[PDB]
């Protein structure tokens, strides 16, 4: 029921510009919350609030935790860029 997108973002000094929700309870999806105006994600224009996050930099996070996905984003921040694979209901 979804469309999948692979999104690349350069990090800005302020980060990638979006909030991550979910993955708190078993089976709970990880997904995009608020997108910051003029941040990397907004500027790039592909990410949408509500998109389900399924992979970060080649590491799958389906069925995995909020903690893991934040860890992967912190590693991406260190390297200065991230690849996101997302799914959105269509």
């Amino acid at each position: 029921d979804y469309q999948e997108q692979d999104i690349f973002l350069w990090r800005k000094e302020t980060g990638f510009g979006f909030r991550i929700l979910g993955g708190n309870e078993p089976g709970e999806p990880i997904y995009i919350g608020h997108i910051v105006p003029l941040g990397a994600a907004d500027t790039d224009g592909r990410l949408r609030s509500g998109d389900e996050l399924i992979c970060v930099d080649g590491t799958p996070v389906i069925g995995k935790s909020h903690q893991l996905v934040v860890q992967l984003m912190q590693q991406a921040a260190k390297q200065g860029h991230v690849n996101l694979t997302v799914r959105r209901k269509v």
């Binding site: 980060g15 979006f18 991550i20 919350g33 910051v36 934040v70």
Partner: peptide
């Protein structure tokens, strides 16, 4: 939290 503060900012 209101939707703009919910979740972890990256």
């Amino acid at each position: 939290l209101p939707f703009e503060l919910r979740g972890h900012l990256v």
